[PDB]
Amino acid sequence: LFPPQWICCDIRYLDVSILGKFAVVMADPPWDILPYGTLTDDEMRRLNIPVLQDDGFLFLWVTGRAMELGRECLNLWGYERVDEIIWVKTNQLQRIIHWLNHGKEHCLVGVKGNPQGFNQGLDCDVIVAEVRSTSHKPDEIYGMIERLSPGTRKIELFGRPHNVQPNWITLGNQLDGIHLLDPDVVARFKQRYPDGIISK
């Protein structure tokens, strides 16, 4: 069901098996690199990403030492890293904002299975876009992912309210409540959670 859907939840404890399969997974984790909903490295490694896809793509934002740790999780979860997107951060005048000042954020791209019918090669691996609020990824990533795999189901982990998109299901603990419209998902959610609460 095409309009935006979301679940306020602790991604550590949600039974993500109820959500089905997804052509694209995107994650923007609170890496321990703590403030404020940080997951430890083990918590990250233990996230049940492997159930979410059979064939498709993972998009994983990484920074600092998570450039290495995210490569670890992605491999442990069953993906090969086949690309890496770079977002060059600019102001409104198209100017660029430890040893070097950082002018970019990185997003790993992983493949699982044998993804077919995707339009590989439409976009290029560099994003130039104006920075908005702190954190907050550029909306260009969604257009890139839509052109790549149009119409398919997508899931985003650790999104915030502004992240919710058509064709996407968004998980995070700062979303407002639960909003599900896809019938297969509403069914499995009511069975798994008859009282609507999501405990450990």
Binding site: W99, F118, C124, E140, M144
Partner: protein, 236 residues
């Protein structure tokens, strides 16, 4: 304004639309501090790396990846280089990793030789003048140079230039400026450099060099006392 959509539309890479107190006294000090350029033709496949002395403060490693062409070195060959044997206990590495599997295999190399990655430097290639790997999901328009540190202890991490002509494997000279502004020390080695990359302040070692002037004792005399611990950003 969506530059990813623009690129889908027009073929102008999004980086084409990026625009633009002195930092020049630093440069003058680097230049006066610089050792004479030194350089040695050597087939690194067959060459005992240990003959390269003394231990280096900076290593710039630029192996000719097959992807640059579209003898080549694989990540299999690069990993077997004994870089740890010639690196000083506190030293830095800059590894050109390309844009494919090198982004992962280069991190393995760095760990194999005892470094941790402290910076990921991206050479972003514009295509203002001319608007595919099977595993690739996107068009690859950039190359990564990984920075590693080992031991105890003003520039951005982007280089933007126009994509070179096909069969041009040269990397932007801008990387040398970034490295030299760090002031990491004066024993600098460039593995797989060419005649065209030879540069003051650097020892260049590669298979295609046409002339050599490297002498181990002559090279070491540049760093005898009292010059032993200089950063290269300091008056003689």
């Amino acid at each position: 304004n969506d530059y990813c959509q623009h690129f889908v539309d027009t073929g102008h890479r999004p980086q084409n639309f990026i625009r633009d107190e002195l930092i020049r006294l630093k440069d003058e000090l680097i230049a006066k501090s610089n050792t004479p350029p030194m350089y040695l033709q050597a087939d690194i496949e067959a060459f005992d790396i240990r003959e390269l002395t003394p231990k280096f403060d900076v290593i710039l490693l630029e192996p000719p990846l097959e992807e640059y062409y579209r003898k080549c070195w694989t990540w299999d060959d690069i990993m077997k280089l004994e870089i740890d044997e010639i690196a000083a206990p506190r030293s830095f590495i800059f590894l050109w990793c390309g844009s494919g599997e090198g982004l992962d295999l280069g991190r393995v190399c760095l760990r194999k030789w005892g470094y941790r990655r402290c910076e990921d430097i991206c050479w972003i290639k514009t295509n203002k003048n001319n608007p595919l790997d099977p595993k690739a999901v996107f068009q690859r328009t950039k190359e990564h140079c990984l920075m590693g540190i080992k031991g105890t202890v003003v520039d951005i991490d982007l280089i933007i230039t126009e994509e070179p002509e096909i069969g041009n494997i040269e990397k932007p000279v801008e990387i040398f400026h970034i490295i030299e502004h760090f002031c990491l020390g004066r024993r600098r080695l460039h593995l797989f450099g060419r005649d065209s990359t030879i540069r003051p302040g650097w020892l260049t070692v590669g298979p295609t060099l046409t002339n050599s002037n490297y002498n181990a004792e002559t090279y070491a005399s540049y760093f005898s006392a009292p010059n032993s611990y200089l950063t290269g950003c300091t008056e003689e």
